Amino acid sequence: MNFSEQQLINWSRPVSTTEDLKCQNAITQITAALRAKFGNRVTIFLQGSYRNNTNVRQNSDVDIVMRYDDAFYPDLYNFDELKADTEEALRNVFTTSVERKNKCIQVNGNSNRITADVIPCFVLKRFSTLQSVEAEGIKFYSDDNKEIISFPEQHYSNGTEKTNQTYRLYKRMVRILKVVNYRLIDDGEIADNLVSSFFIECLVYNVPNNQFISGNYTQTLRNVIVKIYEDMKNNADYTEVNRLFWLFSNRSPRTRQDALGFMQKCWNYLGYQ
Ligand SMILES: [Mg+2]
């Protein structure tokens, strides 16, 4: 195949992490700006690639969640106002670096801090039929009126558990496939939204643990791609990493065909035979 075992190992490593000075600087500065307005009425935490340790690009943007939750976690008002107040708190400090986006407020970085997406949100509680329990996550609204929900804590914990059980290969395989995704996008071979990082993470999550072969990145990656590809042809019922909801739920526009096509492009790019 086209890339050596060592090249796959190199691609499997995290590139940006929460240890990075520029990441710490962004979190510190943004946290101070938000606390100046909201005090203890919010919980601030990370989600996305810095939280799950799946970054494969230098100087990656960080996703900082600001959960307005005074009603649920009190000190021992609609979403439009929350997001506007969040934007104001950030603009007072970061001025022209602040840009409102559809699902977040972006705070553009500089020589000393990474860019950050600040995600104002509320507590969400929803019943999971998969687990027959009420689950707690977050909810917010996009500027184009979609209700966006997430379970970042359960996503974090389940992904960490799987990597701990697979010789650390679960997240290493996610990272490799994210690298291939960016390369295919840069080459114009796939659209930049054929698959997202979240989608890749969920696809690999559903590959059984016994497909991850200690110390064999080439064969593990082969197993991962073949398993997802075949599962997509076979109409498989994949879960999200959070194990609370189905990946191919009728709430989500992404499809098994998207995953099948992505796996094919990865297989061809990597040169497996
Ligand atoms: Mg992200």
Whole-number Å distance, alpha carbon 58 to ligand 1 midpoint, is: 13
Residue 143 makes CB contacts below 8 A (sequence gap 6+) with 100, 101, 102, 103
The whole-angstrom separation of Cα 146 and Cα 272 is 40
The whole-angstrom separation of Cα 225 and Cα 2 is 15
Q: Helix, strand or coil for residue 36?
A: helix
Q: Running DSSP on this structure, what letter comes out for residue 248?
A: T
Whole-number Å distance, alpha carbon 1 to ligand 1 midpoint, is: 31
Q: Give the domain extent around 15.
A: 1-273
Q: Helix, strand or coil for residue 254?
A: coil
Q: Running DSSP on this structure, what letter comes out for residue 234?
A: T
**CA-closest candidate to residue 262, choices 192, 210, 211:** 192
Strands (E) across 71-193 are located at 98-100, 105-107, 116-128, 133-141, 147-150
The whole-angstrom separation of Cα 201 and Cα 178 is 9
Whole-number Å distance, alpha carbon 57 to ligand 1 midpoint, is: 11
Torsion over CA: 89, 94, 99, 102 (sign): negative
**CA-closest candidate to residue 249, choices 202, 209, 196, 215:** 202
Whole-number Å distance, alpha carbon 34 to ligand 1 midpoint, is: 19
Whole-number Å distance, alpha carbon 132 to ligand 1 midpoint, is: 30
Whole-number Å distance, alpha carbon 237 to ligand 1 midpoint, is: 26
Q: Confirm if 109 and 116 have CB atoms less than 8 A apart.
A: yes
Whole-number Å distance, alpha carbon 61 to ligand 1 midpoint, is: 6
Whole-number Å distance, alpha carbon 152 to ligand 1 midpoint, is: 12
The whole-angstrom separation of Cα 204 and Cα 208 is 9
**CA-closest candidate to residue 66, choices 140, 160, 153:** 140
Whole-number Å distance, alpha carbon 107 to ligand 1 midpoint, is: 13
**CA-closest candidate to residue 63, choices 92, 106, 32:** 106
Domain tally, the chain: 1
The whole-angstrom separation of Cα 188 and Cα 11 is 20
Whole-number Å distance, alpha carbon 120 to ligand 1 midpoint, is: 15
Listed residues: CB within 5 A of ion ligand 1: 48-49, 63
| Cα of 162 vs its chain's centroid, Å | 16
Percent helix, percent strand, percent coil in the chain, to nearest 5: 45, 20, 35
**CA-closest candidate to residue 30, choices 107, 133, 120, 119:** 107
Whole-number Å distance, alpha carbon 47 to ligand 1 midpoint, is: 7
Whole-number Å distance, alpha carbon 59 to ligand 1 midpoint, is: 12
Whole-number Å distance, alpha carbon 63 to ligand 1 midpoint, is: 5
Whole-number Å distance, alpha carbon 228 to ligand 1 midpoint, is: 23
The whole-angstrom separation of Cα 125 and Cα 174 is 29
Method for structure elucidation: X-ray
Buried/exposed 208-247: b ≥16 CB within 10 Å, e otherwise: eeebbbeeebbebbbbbbebbbebbeeeeebbbbbbbbeb
Whole-number Å distance, alpha carbon 18 to ligand 1 midpoint, is: 13
The whole-angstrom separation of Cα 89 and Cα 118 is 11
Q: Confirm if 12 and 180 have CB atoms less than 8 A apart.
A: no
Whole-number Å distance, alpha carbon 178 to ligand 1 midpoint, is: 12
The whole-angstrom separation of Cα 74 and Cα 159 is 30
Write the single-letter amino acid at 87.
Answer: E
